[PDB]
Each structure stands twice: as C-alpha cells, then as structure tokens.
C-alpha cells in the first residue's frame, strides 16, 4: 500500500517533554522495521512482547508512537515494571506491554551552551499514574501540612523541575531521546503492517 | 550590536560555481548557529540553510538539497556557503543571518540580519 | 513540510486607522511542554534588510513602538497595528521556526490610503 510516517517521528526537531510526552497514532501502512533496527544510530532497542527481526511479518490493529526527553542515566526507568520517578509520575508502562523502546543520545541537539532549561520533569506527584497516563496540568502541591493556597512557602512546592542539559555534563546526565511503540496485537482488522 | 558583513557573489554562469562568505564580528561565533536566506529581486523572503553552534548538523531547504554546501569555519569567525550547479532561477539577494538560541532544540528564529550580496545568474 | 500562507496581499490603510495582517500554516506549530508558539513576525522596508518585530507570536523584541501586536495560537496568528505613521510603509512577513525547512511568508504592502 504505502509508508507511513516514521520519518516525522524520528526526524523530529522537536521532542517533546517527559511530563507531557506526545503520543501518535499510526495506521494504514506498510511498516518496514528494518530501517529502525539495521540503524546504529540507537542506544537502546528492546522490544518486549515480540521479538525485533519479527516485526516485519506481524499485522496490528493500530500502533502508537510516544514520543519525550530524558536523562540519559534513567533510560532504565522505562520498562513495565521498573518503578522511578518518571517510571512513575511520569510515564508509567503498563506491566503486559507488547511493543519496543527506542533511545538514542542527542547531547547535540537538546543540549545548549547555557544549559536548557525549557525541559521539565514532574516531581512531587501526590500519586503514582495510569499506565499511559498524560497529566499536563500543574497545580500548587502541599508537602506538609500547611494551606497550599498558590503559596510556595517551605512545604507547598512546585511540581516541575528542570534538568541541567549542558554540554559538559556527564555521559549519563546528557539528554536521550525517547520512543516506544506499542502495538494494539487486537484481532481486529488490520491497518498496519509491513510487508 | 552585531555586525555581519556578507562578501562575494556577483556574476555567474549558468552550470557555474559561487562561494559565498559572511565575516561577524561582536559576539562569540562559535556560540550562535547561523542561517542564509535568498531573495529574489522584488519576491519575498525564502530560507536556504541553517548550521549548528559546533558545525556539525546541518539542514537545508527543498529546493537547494544537494546544490549548496554550507560550512562554517569558527577560526576565522565566519559562514562559507558553496552554490553548485546554478539555474537561472538562483540570481538573488542574499542574507546571512544570526541565530537567538532560546527554542528548546538548537535551531531557532533568526533576530539579527546582514546586508545582502546580488548573486546573479546569466551568461 | 509546514507552509505558511499569510493574507492579504496588499493592505491599505490611512494614518490613525488600524490594520490586521493574518497567517496560517499548514501544522499546528504550537509547542505544548512548554505553552510557547513557535512563530515569528518580521518586516523589510523596501531596499534594506528585514527586522525582528514579534517572537513566540505574542511576545515583542525590545525596541519596537508598542502599536504593533501579535495574537493567535494553534495554527492561526495575527499582526494587529493599532495606529498608523510614516515608518510603517513595510512589507511584512511570516515566519516559522518549528520544523526544519523554515518557511516565510508572501508579504503585505502596507501601503497608505489617501
């Protein structure tokens, strides 16, 4: 039939943040996995429920792309168990996930001289999240046990926080970025799949 | 202040090939990427090119992929750009024009602007 | 890629009046880990390089008269000058800044109506 766009997924100028990471659906293709997994360019590539030189032959009622940044030491948080502060907060993988996580190193790109900070993690979530839950909104959080009335005084704190990004940062603290997709293996009929 | 002086350009050939230097001066080259955008006399601003601060990514325009080559030489504080294989549809005006890293990602909206050369194609 | 399509072509305005210039583009250009919206307005005289006049498509770059407003979000925007002189006789143009290549815009001469 015809591609589909992987190119705007991993071509991407603009990832967005771990808190708010944008998710994609992707359908009515020919998907050829090849091209991601004879890649070098990735550090990490781990599919869980299927096998990576298996994709090709497979048929899936709908695949979704999410999409984020993170530091590179906790790429480890993302796994179906595997409990963390982004594994938990803010993403939080489902324990019978069937799909793959790609994560590669863009120290270059996401990293500037001055250090980026217009990428933020949530912290201080009250509770842990749905598997594949998006929580975009970020009210004053209470810490002690004080009024959090749009104070920020010594226990109502703000739930974002910003990494560092600098260039001279360490191997582990430099951004990766990330994307995970996960197939809908439904017996539905058929949208998306290679050839 | 920013000063960006853009050299060459003038006469060509159609099939010929042009170099194109930008000289800056008033702030660290090596910090801030840089991007050339044409104009056609009388048409309207178009994009070309854009560098990274390191040199070492570099994106183009669609109708330039693999005609032009841009590079910047950090040394001698300046922004080389390479036109190969020119059409008569490439004589213009062209800027060099200074990045503002502020986007979250490394490229960004330009803010400060060069006065331009009149590469002009016809034999 | 994103195309931007800015109208109209010609706006002509007597001094005092008010103007608005609108853009479009093809995608969304609106970054959401962040509430910013990457577009920008510029504005070339005729005979000189361009100059820098909104950012963020809201915000304005220091120096600029405060007649001039940028407003919009998502995939619409608009440049909203308020009062009209002699120094406004410039065509204007978009410009994106969210997914490479970059693209501009086909202008608006913004002439003076008598």
């Known amino acids: 039939t015809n591609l589909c766009p992987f190119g705007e997924v991993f071509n991407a100028t603009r990832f967005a943040s771990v808190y708010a990471w944008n998710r994609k659906r992707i359908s009515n293709c020919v998907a050829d996995y090849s091209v991601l997994y004879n890649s070098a360019s990735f550090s990490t590539f781990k599919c869980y429920g299927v096998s990576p030189t298996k994709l090709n032959d497979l048929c899936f009622t709908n695949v979704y792309a999410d999409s984020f940044v993170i530091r590179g030491d906790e790429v480890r948080q993302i796994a179906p168990g595997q409990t963390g502060k982004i594994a938990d907060y803010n993403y939080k993988l489902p324990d019978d996930f069937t799909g793959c996580v790609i994560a590669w190193n863009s120290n270059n790109l996401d990293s500037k001289v001055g250090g980026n900070y217009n990428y933020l993690y949530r912290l201080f979530r009250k509770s842990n999240l749905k598997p594949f839950e998006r929580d975009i909104s970020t009210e004053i959080y209470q810490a002690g046990s004080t009024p959090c009335n749009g104070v920020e005084g010594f226990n109502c704190y703000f739930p974002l926080q910003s990494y560092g990004f600098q260039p001279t940062n360490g191997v582990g603290y430099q951004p990766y970025r990330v994307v995970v997709l996960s197939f809908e293996l439904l017996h539905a009929p058929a949208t998306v799949c290679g050839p | 202040e920013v000063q960006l002086v853009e050299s060459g350009g003038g006469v060509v050939q159609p099939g010929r090939s042009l170099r194109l230097s930008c000289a800056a001066s008033?702030?660290?080259?090596?910090?801030?990427?840089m991007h050339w955008v044409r104009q056609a006399p009388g048409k309207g601003l178009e994009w070309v090119a854009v560098?990274?601060?390191?040199?070492?990514?570099?994106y183009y325009a669609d109708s330039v992929k693999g005609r032009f080559t841009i590079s910047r030489d950090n040394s001698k504080n300046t922004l080389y750009l390479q036109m190969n294989s020119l059409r008569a549809e490439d004589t213009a005006v062209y800027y060099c024009?200074?990045?503002?890293?502020?986007?979250?990602?490394?490229?960004?909206?330009?803010?400060?602007w060069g006065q331009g050369t009149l590469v002009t194609v016809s034999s | 890629d994103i195309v931007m399509t800015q109208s109209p072509d010609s706006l002509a305005v007597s001094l005092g009046e008010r103007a608005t210039i609108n853009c479009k583009s093809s995608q969304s250009v609106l970054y959401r880990s962040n509430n910013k919206n990457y577009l920008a307005w510029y504005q070339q005289k005729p005979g000189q390089p361009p100059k820098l006049l909104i950012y963020?498509?809201?915000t304005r770059e220091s120096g600029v008269p405060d007649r001039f407003s940028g407003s919009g979000s998502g995939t619409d925007f608009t440049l909203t000058i308020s009062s009209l002189q002699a120094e406004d006789v410039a065509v204007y143009y978009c410009?994106?800044?969210?997914?490479?290549?970059?693209?501009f815009g086909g202008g608006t001469k913004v002439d003076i109506k008598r």
């Open positions: 410009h994106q800044y969210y997914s490479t290549p970059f693209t």
């Open positions: 963020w498509a809201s």
């Open positions: 024009a200074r990045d503002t890293e502020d986007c979250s990602s490394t490229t960004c909206y330009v803010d400060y």
């Open positions: 008033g702030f660290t080259f090596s910090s801030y990427p």
């Open positions: 560098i990274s601060y390191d040199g070492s990514n570099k």
